[PDB]
Structure formats: C-alpha cells, structure tokens
C-alpha cells in the first residue's frame, strides 16, 4: 500500500496490487514469491555444505550435473525445489488502511456465516474458535 | 431458435412500457455503486405476475404452463436490459410474485399433472441441508501465450432447460499444448443448497404418514430459512436423474426423484416510512401517554397496569454505559412474577414474546447448557444477544444452571473455560421469569420470605419481584366476567415500531433535576424497608437509575427528569409495597 503512493501521486502511475492480490492471492503466491529467486543474494555468507543435511544431496547433484553436463557438450531442477522458504501474505486491518482506499479492506474479520461462494480464490479473515486442530503430518 | 429470440424481443417490450420494474433495476445499479463510493444486495428483480396479464395472456399461460422454455429467454432479456443501463464502474435472477394460482398446492397434493409447471409449495422446512460451495464458471491463465481461458461447466441444475453435461474437473492444457493454472477468485462460484419441505401438521388428513418433497435453492435464497420455519416457496417443479432407465439393468420400479429450482421463498406467518415517524413525534408531547401505552399491552388482562408499566421499561432499558478503561454498569432491567396459578404469568410471557422483537423462550429444564455455547465436540443467552428471554417455571430449574444464570445477568458475560475453546463470551439480554409459589397456593399469606424458595442473590439480581395474589372477591369476580364474555366475541401492532425509534434515537443521559428525588428515596428505602422487609442493597439503587432512564426513553426526552424518577419511585414501591 505504501509503495503506491510513491508510484502515483508522486509518479509514475502504474497498476495496482493491494486489490489484484486478495482478488487472486493463489496466483501471487507462484508469481510473487518466485521474483525472490531473481534478486537473492547469491554468495550469500557462510553457507558451506554440511552444516545441513539434505542441502548437499542437492549441492551434489548440480556438482555432479554441471560436471557431467559440461563433459557431454565438450532443462534444469525446478525452482520450487530449491526454496527452503515460506512466503506469507498478512491482513492490513489497518491504522494505514485509513489512507484511503476503503473497500480494499478484507481484512474484514467476518463471521463464518459471512463466508460466501464468492469469496473463493481471494483473502479472507475470519475468526473462530480452533476445532479438532489435526495433529501434524508431511505434506 | 428464432423463438427463443421472439421471448426476448417480447419480453423486451413489457419492461419501459409500463416502466415499473426498470427503476427497480436502475436502483440495484445506483446502490452497489453508491457502496463503490462508500467510506451486499442480491441482483435480482422481483416480477410480479399481476402485471403480466395486461400485455400478453398468451406468453402468461406459457410461464406457467412451460417454465423451461420461457424463463431463461426472459432472463437473457433482463441481463440484456441490465446492461444497457448505466453503465459498466452477472446472470441475475427472476422471481415471479403472484397472482396466485392453479398451481396454488400444498405439497400433498402434486405429482404429475403439476409436473414440468410452476408452482407454488407451502409447508414446514426440515431439516435445511448445510450450505456448500458449487462450481459454475472456469477461469484459466496461459503462460507465456498468456490471453486468458476459460471453460463453463453445466450442471444438473444450470439454467433450467437440460443440457449435455459438461462436469467435471479441470481443462488442464486445452490446445495447442500451453499450461494452465486455476484462476481462483476470478472464476464464478454460485452458494447452492437444498431443503425438504414437509406439508402443513394441521391440515394433515389422518394418522396417514406427511409427503415431503425437496426445494433447492439457488445463489442468493441460500441461508435465508432456518428449520422449522412456515414458507411458500415457489419455483419450477423439476425431475431429474434416471429413473434406472439408463443403466442397463435398476431394475426397481422405483425412480425420477423430483425437485423445485430456485426460486424465491416467501416466509409467512423495521420500515418507518414517512408517516409513522410523524405520529411518534406528535403523541411524544402529550403527558398522559405513558398509561395508555401501558393498557395497550393487555387486551385480554385486567389491573396489572403496574405490570405491564414494568414490561415496556424492560422493553426500553435504561441505555448502555461503557466506562473509559472501566466496567459497565448493566443496562437493562430483569423482571419475576409470583402468584398462584391462572394469574396469567404463563399467558403474559407470550405476549412479551411475540411484540419484543426477538427472543428465544425458554421453559423451566430446558437447557442443556441454556446460554453456553457448550463447546461442541467435535445457546439461548447468546443468541438472545440485545432482547427478552423469557423463563417459565423459573423456579424448578436446576440450581447447577442458576450458578450460571447470576454470571449472565449483572455481570452481563458469559465464560467458557470448558475444554476446549477458551472466550469470554457477550450476552447482555434483558430477562423475564414466572416462578410457581413454593408449595401449593400459600403464597399470598406466606412470610416476606421462604415464599419465594429459591434464595439468594437471585432475588436480588432481578431488578424487580412482582408478587400477584389470585384470592376471591364476589365484585372482583363480576368485573372478570363481562370481559371475559366481550372477549370471546391506538393499534398494537404501532407499538413494537414506536419502540425501534425510541430504542436507537435517542439515549437521555443523565441529569440534575432527577439526582437527589432517588437519592432520598433509596436512602428511605434502605433504613425504613429493612425494618419492614428484604431485600435492599446497592443494587436497588442501579435499578432506580434504570427505570429512571427508560421513563425517559418513553418520554422521547433527550434528557432525564424529575417526573420520572418519581414513577420509578411509584413501581418500586407497588414491587416492595
């Protein structure tokens, strides 16, 4: 919301995220996120091999096929396999809200009752007390 | 299908002349957008069948006759209207008022002839099949060929009309062979739902068992009925799935299960308007009107004038009052009856019900959990939530719930540490209850106290004990019975709308006039009454700031005054003395 206003008023105008996310918000999680993987530091500082278990199969296996694959020409592991990161969006309730863009706003702590078929595939609050709370499983 | 184009053009022509409907349609434009500038209603636009007559008596046997082939093109044609108007900064729906009918069944009698044809059902609803999501439009999105893709899924109940079924799952790489990710939250998904509608219980012929036949109820209609509830529902009579014919041996007799679409659910059994407003501004000045509004509660009650006084300020309630960083004090008044029986107490409580504008009624155990929300694996007080609960026999409830009931009512919260969900929890109502003497019909003779039987700070809690005595008198007697002869042989209904207004505008605060009359009288109250009886404490005192308040309410008064401090001086002296 705050970057906006530098992009506008205060140009230059460009078209808005705060509405095309929650409109969307399963979308901007594979797109969003993968812009990540773009600007991330690469060295970064430190980061060895092992230290951490499961990163150096990975480690070796873009050894082992760099190697292999520079030796064949003497297409690639997906990017989702390599995170281990977990990006979250959050609710802007908000003092800020009060910018204003109003209707912006869900991040409206609803009732379940409130829950339309209309809602699907965009952000909502809602709130409740926890039921049966199913014991952790991997995905 | 030139025909289908012949609806649309037809039906083209009834709307804008006459006009009636169009700014109905205009209204549902403006208002959404009127929300677009703010800082919900469903599109639909109610059609009267008593209009369609005048124009065309062809196209409306047809509607009732054929609904397949007449209410979509009409919609294409409303959605079609919808557009042209204004402007662009969706399918709608029909309704179909009535104007009724042929076509007017009850459920028991229907099946065949009705078949195919609207109609309008009407009976009890049960047990109301929980509200689901269903899928309707597809929305896609191509990368990098990008464009956007989208499919349109046909179910059993789409439109109307019956179509080659287009389910299910995803389009997943429609060519060439580009991939295609789920668009959620742009893709469409109308709420659907389906409930059972059972014939009326008191029109039913004989021990013979009811015949219940099932209404789905399409986008908006959804949630609109809770079980149990008398409705006319309306709607295209449908029979859908194989009767087993399809499957190749099934071979059952049994088969083509039947069911009604849509359509808009008119329960059976708020607006101020212009006018109405103007008679409550108007009778607010006159001084007399507190008593008659007090008589319009009871046609068929004699006396209790007292009583019934005390029910409207109950119905009234003395504000809120939140503190800053502080406790509330309670606003509204709690009320008890004790008598010996055919005193009305039962019979008053309905009354209070039906005029209160909710709530829930509850009668002696009763419960389980009352007011809780009893945290379910894996109530009452809160659902009543800003209204009157009522309490019959309140005397025979278990004491395990009354341990609850005094959190309830002074407190005005309800906790839950049960397993669990761990809240506290608001409910605030305001409360009625009617309690049977301890035994027999002693009460009347019976001492100040041990007649009430269930002490402590119960009798307390209730802001107000009304005692009434049903003992005999010749004169008494005589003036019962000419009444109660009329009976078997200004308006009521003006009295739940001149309560609304005066429930939100506006509350009178407190002043100076007032003050030092209850304070005078509760310090009476406390040093004279404990010599003659009990109960007194500071809680008394709240009460009178109440009634004090809620007199005003009557009164319209933007402030509290000296006048009615002095009646609530009067009922708590006919409740002590």
């Given at each position: ?25 399963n979308?901007?999680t ?56 977990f990006?979250y ?23 379940v009752?409130?829950i339309?078929?209309?809602?699907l595939?965009?952000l909502i609050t809602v709130r409740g007390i926890i039921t049966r709370v199913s014991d952790v499983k991997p995905a | ?129 929980l509200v689901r999501p ?239 929300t009893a945290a379910v694996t894996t ?37 839950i540490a049960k397993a669990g969900i761990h809240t ?154």
């Open positions: 919301l705050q970057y906006q206003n530098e992009k506008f008023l205060q140009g230059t105008q460009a078209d808005d995220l705060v509405s095309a996310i929650q409109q969307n918000a979308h901007f594979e797109l969003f996120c993968r812009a990540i993987d773009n600007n991330m530091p690469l060295p970064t500082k430190e980061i060895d091999y092992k230290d951490d278990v499961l990163d150096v199969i990975l480690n070796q296996r873009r050894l082992r096929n760099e190697r292999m694959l520079s030796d064949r020409t003497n297409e690639l592991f997906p990017p989702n396999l390599t995170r281990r990161y990006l969006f959050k609710p802007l309730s908000q003092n800020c809200a009060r910018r204003y863009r109003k209707k912006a706003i869900s991040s409206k702590p609803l009732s009752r409130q339309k078929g209309d809602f595939g965009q | 299908d030139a025909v289908f184009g012949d609806r649309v053009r037809r039906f083209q022509e009834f709307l804008d002349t006459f006009t009636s409907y169009r700014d109905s349609v205009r209204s549902i434009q403006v208002y959404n957008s009127n929300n677009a500038a703010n800082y919900i209603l469903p599109h639909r636009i109610i059609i009267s069948l008593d209009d369609l007559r005048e124009f065309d008596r062809s196209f409306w046997s047809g509607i009732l006759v054929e609904p397949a082939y007449f209410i979509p093109p009409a919609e294409k044609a409303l959605t079609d209207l919808a557009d042209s108007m204004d402007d662009v900064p969706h399918p709608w729906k029909l309704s179909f008022k009535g104007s009724f009918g042929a076509h007017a069944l009850s459920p028991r009698t229907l099946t065949a002839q009705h078949l195919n044809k609207l109609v309008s059902v009407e009976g009890i609803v049960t047990k109301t099949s269903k899928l309707i439009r597809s929305v896609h999105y191509a990368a990098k060929t990008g464009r956007f893709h989208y499919r349109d899924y046909t179910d059993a109940t789409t439109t109307l009309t019956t179509r080659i079924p287009t389910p299910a799952i995803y389009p997943t790489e429609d060519t060439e062979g580009n991939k295609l990710t789920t668009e959620y939250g742009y893709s469409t998904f109308i709420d659907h739902q389906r409930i059972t509608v059972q014939e009326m219980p008191e029109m039913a012929p004989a021990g013979q068992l009811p015949r219940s036949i099932d209404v789905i109820l399409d986008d908006d209609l959804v949630d609109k009925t809770k079980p149990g509830d008398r409705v006319n529902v309306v709607g295209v009579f449908k029979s859908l799935g194989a009767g087993g014919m399809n499957q190749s041996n099934s071979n059952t007799l049994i088969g083509f299960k039947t069911l009604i679409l849509g359509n808009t659910v008119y329960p059976l059994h708020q607006m101020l308007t212009d006018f109405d407003i103007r008679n409550i501004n108007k009778l607010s000045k006159k001084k007399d009107i507190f008593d008659i509004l007090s008589q319009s509660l009871a046609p068929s009650i004699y006396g209790h004038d007292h009583i019934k006084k005390a029910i409207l300020l109950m119905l009234m309630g003395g504000v809120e009052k939140n503190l800053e960083n502080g406790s509330h004090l309670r606003g509204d008044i709690n009320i008890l009856m004790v008598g010996d029986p055919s005193t009305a107490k039962s019979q008053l409580l309905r009354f209070v019900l039906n005029t209160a504008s909710l709530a829930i009624a509850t009668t002696g155990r009763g419960s389980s959990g009352v007011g809780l109530g009452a007080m809160v659902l009543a939530d800003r209204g009157v609960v009522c309490i019959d026999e309140f005397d025979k409830m278990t004491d395990v719930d009354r341990v609850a009931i005094h959190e309830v009512m002074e407190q005005q919260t309800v906790t506290t929890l608001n409910a605030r109502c305001s409360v009625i209850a009617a309690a049977n003497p301890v035994f027999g019909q002693y009460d009347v003779n019976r001492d100040p106290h041990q007649n009430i039987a269930l002490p402590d700070s119960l009798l307390s809690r209730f802001d107000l004990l009304f005692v009434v005595t049903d003992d005999i008198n010749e004169i008494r007697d005589r003036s019962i019975s000419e009444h109660v002869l009329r009976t078997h042989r200004v308006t009521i209904p003006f009295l739940r709308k001149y309560v609304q207004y005066a429930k939100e505008r506006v509350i009178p605060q407190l002043t100076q006039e007032a003050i030092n009359v209850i304070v005078k009288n509760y310090t009476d109250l406390r040093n004279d009454d404990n010599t003659k009886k009990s109960p007194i404490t500071a809680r008394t005192l709240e009460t009178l700031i109440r009634l004090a308040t809620a007199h005003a309410k009557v009164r319209l008064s933007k402030t509290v005054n000296k006048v009615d401090a002095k009646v609530a001086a009067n009922l708590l002296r006919f409740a002590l003395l």
